[PDB]
Amino acid sequence: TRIKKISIEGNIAAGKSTFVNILKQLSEDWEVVPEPVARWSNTMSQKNGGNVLQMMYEKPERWSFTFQTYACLSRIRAQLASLNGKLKDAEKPVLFFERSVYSDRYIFASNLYESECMNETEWTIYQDWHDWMNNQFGQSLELDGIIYLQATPETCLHRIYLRGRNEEQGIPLEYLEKLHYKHESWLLHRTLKTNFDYLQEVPILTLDVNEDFKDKYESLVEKVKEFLSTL
Amino acid sequence: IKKISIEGNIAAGKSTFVNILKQLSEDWEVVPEPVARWSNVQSTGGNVLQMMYEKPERWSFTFQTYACLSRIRAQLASLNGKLKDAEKPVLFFERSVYSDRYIFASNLYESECMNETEWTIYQDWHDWMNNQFGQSLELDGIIYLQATPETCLHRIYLRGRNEEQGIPLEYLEKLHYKHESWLLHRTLKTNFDYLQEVPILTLDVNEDFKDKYESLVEKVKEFLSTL
Ligand SMILES: Cc1ccc(NC(=O)c2ccc(CN3CCN(C)CC3)cc2)cc1Nc1nc(-c2cccnc2)cs1
Ligand SMILES: O=c1ccn([C@@H]2O[C@H](COP(=O)(O)OP(=O)(O)O)[C@@H](O)[C@H]2O)c(=O)[nH]1
Ligand SMILES: O=c1ccn([C@@H]2O[C@H](COP(=O)(O)OP(=O)(O)O)[C@@H](O)[C@H]2O)c(=O)[nH]1
Ligand SMILES: Nc1ccn([C@H]2C[C@H](O)[C@@H](COP(=O)(O)O)O2)c(=O)n1
């Protein structure tokens, strides 16, 4: 489509929602599509969404498959509906997504299967499912570049505390670390091999969101806007 | 590309009758229930059908979802078959997506195996699946293979499928009633509005037709002439 698609990636509490908001406000033809999993951190889809997430917190090993499949469905469904937004009849349309279909499977669900929360028959079903739902759409959802909000696992643990979600207070530094490394291996080093080929040659901008960018954000916004010309 | 559904209870006589019809003529093909794709989970062991009967309080959601998505997959694949290339093409589906929700998943939710969250997620999913990908799988006529839950319980034993040799009558009963309330009594209301005016051909399959299937083909040939 005419509408370009950019993915906003990063660790838990790295600064994705703060950045996507700073971008929503800007007077450009940009539409932001939030993470359904973030919308459950607080409708006929939230009712479910909140309950799986609350169940995901309580018993991880039981809900990891139920949750990861409803995350990717509520993401796929959303992102497709965003493409039909006003932007179509807009000049320079850019659609930014809080995370992506690739971040779900490769970074989080994978880590969840590795964490012995999804069994082997559970993982096979998720992988065969994901593979199929992505293949059954096309260039519709294909990313035209990714933005990696790089932050040390320690800034994420202090921002987890900042955010104040009491369910997330328990999250340990090791978990963030384990996530951080899975990000760097895909986005930075690019040693992580996804099923979807096209990702191999996709531009990636890496914004060091370590020091609070909440109010000092003109610097990123420019390095973003230039990144946008190169696509 | 006339799409017919073959509906009925566990071991009522769906494949038997389906495979009698398939042999009968060209331009007639069958889209079986992938109850072996569930039996050996791979990427198109792991017997998601056994784990389900083992502990449904833990596997019913995981199952009905994979059962439904594997169907949508093979049913859609069959429409892109060689049937399109012949006169009078009538494709026969062993059960449907309406069967996977209004009978089996619905019963499991009613039997406490799926908590409300699981059930709501299943409906949310099955609704969006059928709206998007299954916009072409809309049935042209349903054949109901009506058999007592007692007969099914005897055929289940004849079959000797171990995954299900531990099925109580209660279960077969609960399903027999749901198929009656949907296909005979016509009172199981669905999210898919057209279903309301889809012809049904209810055939009693209690008295064995393995070699006495003459009458049933004579009725179905007539049924497919109204369609
Ligand atoms: C919300 C949530 C809350 C708690 C947990 N649980 C854990 O991180 C976790 C807790 C305990 C363990 C330890 N297990 C204990 C039991 N044992 C069987 C195995 C090991 C392993 C993992 C997972 C999550 N799941 C998450 N999903 C996401 C996510 C975001 C975006 C898209 N998809 C998923 C982020 S965090
Ligand atoms: O530069 C930053 C980025 C984020 N935050 C805060 O840190 C928390 C986590 O950030 P965010 O909501 O963006 O989480 P994410 O979407 O990355 O998971 C929130 O309370 C933000 O307001 C902040 O104070 N400064
Ligand atoms: O007229 C019939 C139809 C079936 N069967 C037996 O019933 C079992 C289950 O048959 P089928 O798989 O066709 O039923 P479905 O479960 O597909 O409804 C098998 O062991 C068949 O030999 C039978 O004895 N007589
Ligand atoms: N949506 C569905 C469809 C089928 N089955 C299971 C019940 C039986 O164990 C088996 C019946 O297979 P068939 O009638 O094709 O032999 O499939 C199920 O639990 N849920």
Residue numbers in the entry:
A (entry chain A): 19 to 60, 72 to 260
B (entry chain B): 21 to 64, 78 to 260
The paper states:
In order to understand this activation mechanism, we solved crystal structures of dCK in complex with masitinib/UDP and imatinib/UDP. We found that the masitinib pyridine ring mimics a pyrimidine base in the nucleoside binding site, while the rest of the molecule extends to a cavity only available in the ‘open’ conformation of dCK. For both molecules, interactions with dCK mainly involve non-polar interactions, without direct polar interactions. Additionally, for each ligand-bound structure, a supplementary electron density was present at the top of the cavity, likely corresponding to a second molecule of compound interacting weakly with the first one in a similar binding mode as the ‘F-series’ inhibitors reported previously. Moreover, it should be noted that masitinib and imatinib were able to open dCK in situ, since we were able to obtain these 3D structures in the ‘open’ conformation by soaking the protein kinase inhibitors in a ‘closed’ dCK crystal. The binding of these compounds also released the monophosphorylated substrate (2′-deoxycytidine-5′-monophosphate), observed in the ‘closed’ dCK crystal and still present in the other nucleoside binding site subunit, elucidating at the same time its mechanism of action. Furthermore, our structural data revealed that binding of masitinib or imatinib promotes and maintains an open conformation of dCK, critical for the release of products and the subsequent nucleoside binding. In contrast, our structures show that TKIs binds partially at the active site, but without strong direct hydrogen bond interactions and without sterically interfering with the catalytic residues.
